[PDB]
Amino acid sequence: SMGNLIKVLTRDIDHNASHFFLDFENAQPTEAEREIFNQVNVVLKDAEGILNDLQSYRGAGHEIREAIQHPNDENLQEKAWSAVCPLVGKLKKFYEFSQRLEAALHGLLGALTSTPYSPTQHLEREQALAKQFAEILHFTLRFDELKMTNPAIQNDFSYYRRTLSRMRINNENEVNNELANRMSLFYAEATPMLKTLSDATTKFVSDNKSLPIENTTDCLSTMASVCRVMLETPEYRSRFASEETVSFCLRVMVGVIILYDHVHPVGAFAKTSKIDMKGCIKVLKDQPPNSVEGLLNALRYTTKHLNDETTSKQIKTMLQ
């Protein structure tokens, strides 16, 4: 049922572009999925506004550089402050939305990693939740791809913190030092949303001591192979691979690979791993470079076991 797993994960997304929530009537969640599907779909619904606010993040680099150049001109200091404050408000909204992804992820993992059923049976029984999990990873990579290309995010927040301290000594919606420290560590990450999801998955394995870790890791590796097989077999490429479906599974694949590398003890590159690392990197390399470079850079730096001595030198050359 490799073909069925592909149709389940890639259903109603060709006729659906740039939407992360699932239509309740179209997804058809079972009675056991209803309470989790509704809660996660509320987060996925708000995920569109988060991504559009990041696409519209213009930055305040122009006003900041003029204020730094003329530091005694209070009009330029107030103009830069008036431009950076609503941008910091967006950054505060992005970080708080990352906390909502952790709550929705626990509900999905708790249902997709039940004790008796296998990973393949879970993705077929809980189709609506399995589809929601892929949408969370789809938004996660798409958010981080934009953040990696926008250097004004860290520059605007760093200027905000420096100005706030030397403005709260000289002369409600403001950001306290405790929240600012967590936000600074959040945006210092290469993939902030993916690092957040990676820690939440490690938390889920830790919170369920009586649950075998394979129920979680083999769930990630199953989804990775579903996307890899469809993208590398022309018999499935001529049947499902569209620009919307390819870009969807490219980001789902890289997402579960990085989660698997942080959760599985030996990592995603070791000889006991279940991820076909060579096959996954090849799929990314066979794509136009401009639409994958953000995903490749995630594998070069965000990963945990890439630079290990156990990791094959063959894939290290692929990732160069």
Residue numbers in the entry: 0 to 170, 176 to 324
Task: Share the article's original sentences.
Previously known as FAM49B, CYRI-B is a protein that is highly conserved across the Eukaryota and has recently been revealed to be a key regulator of Rac1 activity. The similarity in structure suggests that CYRI-B interacts with Rac1 in the same manner as CYFIP1 and therefore regulates actin-dependent processes by competition with the WRC for Rac1 binding.
We therefore produced SeMet-substituted protein, which allowed us to determine the structure of CYRI-B by SAD phasing. Solved by X-ray crystallography at 2.4 Å resolution using the SAD method, the structure reveals three distinct, entirely α-helical, subdomains and high structural similarity to a conserved domain of CYFIP1. The native and SeMet-derivatized protein crystals have similar unit-cell dimensions and belong to the same ortho­rhombic space group, P212121. They were solved at resolutions of 2.37 and 2.40 Å, respectively. In both cases, a single molecule is present in the asymmetric unit. The two models are nearly identical and could be aligned with a Cα r.m.s.d. of 0.29 Å for 320 atoms. This loop connects helices α7 and α8 of the medial subdomain. As presented in Fig. 2(a), the native and SeMet-derivative proteins migrate as a single band on both native and SDS–PAGE gels.
